[PDB]
Structure formats: C-alpha cells, structure tokens
Design an enzyme around this catalytic site. Structure first.
Site: not given
Lengths: 14, 244
Positions: B194-195, B56, B99
C-alpha cells in the site's frame, strides 16, 4: 471483501 | 538527474509473483516506517521533499513525528549503509477523502543514483486499456519467493468499464481509481505494498500513474488490484507542494 494492502491490512465486509 | 529515469535499468520480469528487482533500479521506491522501525507501507518519492502514499497507511497516527521514510534501500530489514532515513515533518490527506496522501520530508532527500523522484502524469490523463506498467514493494508474497527484498511485477492496466463487471469487481471501482493485473491471477500487490507505486513507461521515463490501495485478496483470478488514479489528483498534489 475490500482489503487495503497495508501491514496490517484493513478489510471490509464487501 | 531527471525524474523517472533510473540509473540501473530494471529487468523485464518474465508483491505476489513477479521477481526481485535489480538493486536500485526503482530509485523512487520508499519504505514508510513507524517511528520505532517497522516497515508497514510503501511510497513514491515525487520530488526531494515530497513522498506520495495512501491515506489509509496513516490511520494509526496523525502526528508526523510517528513516521520516517527510507530511501534508496533494497532490503526490508538489514538496510544497506548508504540508505537515507528522513523523518516526516508534515502530513497532507486529499481533501475529498480519497485514499492518497503526501508526506513532507523534514530535510530534502539527497538526489543520488539510488534516490531519484518519479514523474507525475498530465492532470486527468487516462492510462489506456492494456498499457503495461510496473508495481514495486516489499509486501506479502504468498510463497512466490522474494520475501524481504524489493520485488517488482509487470501488470497490464484494465479499463474501468471492464474491470467493474460482475464477474470481476462488480461496481466497486470509482473513476478516481484504476485496475491492473492478470485476470488469470497469480500476480498482484499485497499487504505491505500500500502507498507504493504503479509506474508506466512513456517515451524515455516512468510516469507514476497509480498508488497501491486495495483488492479482493491478492493474485486471485478475476480479481485485479485497485490503485488510486494519480492523474486525477495532480493539481491537488502540486498545490500542496508549492505552498508547503
């Protein structure tokens, strides 16, 4: 209520 | 150098909560940035050519030339002189639409004492209930200090059957995800993380076991953070790396 933690985030109604 | 072995030993911390890391104690931490220089996500260097992150993070552009990875950094903005800044050449999203994604650097990262890949888990391995792990990133802090510096937090892993109870995440968490956090609240990854990695120490090195993905807010009681379970995608990740 589910919110992905990127900038800016992405939130969903759950 | 060996994967998952930092040249600066990270401080056991006595991102919301946690603490500012020792500079370069997490040498696989990547700052994923827009072509025009904004930090918007994290990532994990898993080999000199490959960055593991969340699908995402890439929704705003499918073109690799829109992203650049920053390696070896401690600050979010006024980067150090020896920071590495490599453009992304290829993007690979996991093919069942989970994701997680892979960036391929356009020139391999130079492995120094400040830039070191992390190790991958054995495929389909389940990090046991209550395993102590670490999250890192430059994300939102919600006033817990450390804004603009690489922060860390020590988190226990919460097994899925418990994490999926009504009073917690009430069924939302899939088997290809894992939960981690303090059910009391106060510590989590947040927007901008995120990530990024969730790593767990094993024997003598850190093993990347999760990728920062989503949550019901950040650091809220009974609402732990959810991470993509990296062991469920190891065979995929290796297939992409060995063919590109």
């Amino acid at each position: 209520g589910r919110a992905y933690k990127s900038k800016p985030p992405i939130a969903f109604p759950d | 150098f060996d994967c998952g072995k930092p040249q600066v030993e990270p401080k056991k911390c006595p991102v919301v909560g946690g603490c500012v890391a020792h500079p370069h104690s997490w040498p696989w931490q990547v700052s994923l940035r827009t072509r025009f220089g904004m930090h918007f996500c994290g990532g994990t260097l898993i080999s000199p050519e490959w960055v593991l992150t969340a699908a995402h993070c890439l929704e705003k552009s499918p073109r690799p030339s829109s992203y650049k990875v920053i390696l070896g950094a401690h600050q979010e903005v006024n980067l150090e002189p020896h920071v590495q800044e490599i453009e992304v050449s290829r993007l690979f999203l996991e093919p069942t639409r989970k994701d997680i994604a892979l960036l391929k650097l356009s020139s391999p990262a130079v492995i120094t004492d400040k830039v070191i890949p992390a190790c991958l888990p054995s495929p389909n391995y389940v990090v046991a209930d209550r395993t102590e792990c670490f999250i890192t990133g430059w994300g939102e802090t919600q006033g817990t200090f450390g804004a603009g510096l690489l922060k860390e937090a020590q988190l226990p892993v919460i097994e899925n059957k418990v994490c999926n109870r009504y009073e917690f995440l009430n069924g939302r968490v899939q088997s290809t995800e894992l939960c981690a956090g303090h059910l009391a609240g106060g510590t989590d990854s947040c927007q901008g993380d995120s990530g990024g990695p969730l790593v767990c120490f094993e024997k003598d090195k850190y093993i990347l076991q999760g990728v920062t993905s989503w949550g019901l807010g950040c650091a809220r009681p009974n609402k732990p953070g959810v991470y993509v379970r990296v062991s469920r995608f190891v065979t995929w990740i290796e297939g992409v790396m060995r063919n590109n």
